[PDB]
Amino acid sequence: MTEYKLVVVGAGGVGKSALTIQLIQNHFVDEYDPTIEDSYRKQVVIDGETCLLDILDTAGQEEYSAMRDQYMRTGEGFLCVFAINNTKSFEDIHQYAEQIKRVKDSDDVPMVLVGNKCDLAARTVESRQAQDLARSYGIPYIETSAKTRQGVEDAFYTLVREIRQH
Ligand SMILES: Nc1nc2c(ncn2[C@@H]2O[C@H](COP(=O)(O)OP(=O)(O)NP(=O)(O)O)[C@@H](O)[C@H]2O)c(=O)[nH]1
Ligand SMILES: [Ca+2]
Ligand SMILES: [Ca+2]
Ligand SMILES: [Mg+2]
């Protein structure tokens, strides 16, 4: 069966771990335990095809930024996550995308831009602004809530599907 190496990246506290765990284990993590680097694997059927998701959950804390080159080298598709209630996290997205783009020596690396925590009402990043960023990269924008499960499967499966267009 095909195996897809997905990497989830973005600023700390945007909900990377919560997204991943919601996808893989089907529950919401309410507490905030900052991640160093964790791995998850799950057989899923996507568009008729049995396949293996290998998902790397990465550090948002910038002290662990040295570890980025290593996972950006290995990973096949990148979930680029900001929180819609954290403008700074949206501004941080570029640093992640550029580095992926640099490290992979490609302007065409499978990516999906994810606006997380769309259940919260304190939005400071309007959808249209994220859509504009995603358009410049030539990638999809998808809003998610790790809390309600809205968009969680869409976001990850779209990433698997971007890896398949490439
Ligand atoms: N309301 C709401 N809270 C969320 C959502 N996703 C994550 N959170 C909350 O935000 C906090 C941070 O979540 P977490 O997944 O650990 O963030 P992270 O991006 O993995 N952090 P790190 O980079 O340090 O590993 C947690 O308290 C979590 O419950 C979401 O969609 N909605
Ligand atoms: Ca919980
Ligand atoms: Ca504004
Ligand atoms: Mg985490």
Swiss-Prot record:
Effect noted on mutating residue 61 to K: In NMTC2; somatic mutation; increases transformation of cultured cell lines
Outcome, altering residue 35 to S: Loss of interaction with PLCE1
Any single GO BP term: positive regulation of JNK cascade
Effect caused by changing residue 12 to V: In CSTLO, bladder carcinoma and CMEMS; constitutively activated; interacts and recruits PLCE1 to plasma membrane
Effect on the protein of changing residue 61 to V: Strongly increased transformation of cultured cell lines
Catalytic activity: GTP + H2O = GDP + phosphate + H(+)
CDD domains for this protein: H_N_K_Ras_like
Membrane topology field: Lipid-anchor
Positions bearing carbohydrate: 35
Outcome following mutation: residue 26 to G: Loss of interaction with PLCE1
Gene Ontology MF term list: G protein activity; GDP binding; GTP binding; GTPase activity; phospholipase C activator activity; protein-membrane adaptor activity
Residues that coordinate or bind GTP: 13-18, 29-35, 59-60, 116-119, 145-147
GO cellular component, one term: endoplasmic reticulum membrane
Keywords: Acetylation, Cell membrane, Cytoplasm, Disease variant, Glycoprotein, Golgi apparatus, GTP-binding, Hydrolase, Isopeptide bond, Lipoprotein, Membrane, Methylation, Nucleotide-binding, Nucleus, Palmitate, Prenylation, Proto-oncogene, S-nitrosylation, Ubl conjugation
Outcome reported for the amino acid change (mutating residue 119 to N): Loss of GTP-binding activity
N-acetylmethionine, modified sites: 1
EC code(s) of this entry: 3.6.5.2
Variant or mutagenesis effect after changing residue 34 to G: No effect on interaction with PLCE1
Involvement in disorder: Costello syndrome: A rare condition characterized by prenatally increased growth, postnatal growth deficiency, intellectual disability, distinctive facial appearance, cardiovascular abnormalities (typically pulmonic stenosis, hypertrophic cardiomyopathy and/or atrial tachycardia), tumor predisposition, skin and musculoskeletal abnormalities.
Task performed by this protein: Involved in the activation of Ras protein signal transduction. Ras proteins bind GDP/GTP and possess intrinsic GTPase activity.
Subunit structure: In its GTP-bound form interacts with PLCE1. Interacts with TBC1D10C. Interacts with RGL3. Interacts with HSPD1. Found in a complex with at least BRAF, HRAS, MAP2K1, MAPK3 and RGS14. Interacts (active GTP-bound form) with RGS14 (via RBD 1 domain). Forms a signaling complex with RASGRP1 and DGKZ. Interacts with RASSF5. Interacts with PDE6D. Interacts with IKZF3. Interacts with RACK1. Interacts with PIK3CG; the interaction is required for membrane recruitment and beta-gamma G protein dimer-dependent activation of the PI3K gamma complex PIK3CG:PIK3R6. Interacts with RAPGEF2.
Listed name of the protein: GTPase HRas
Gene expressing this chain: HRAS
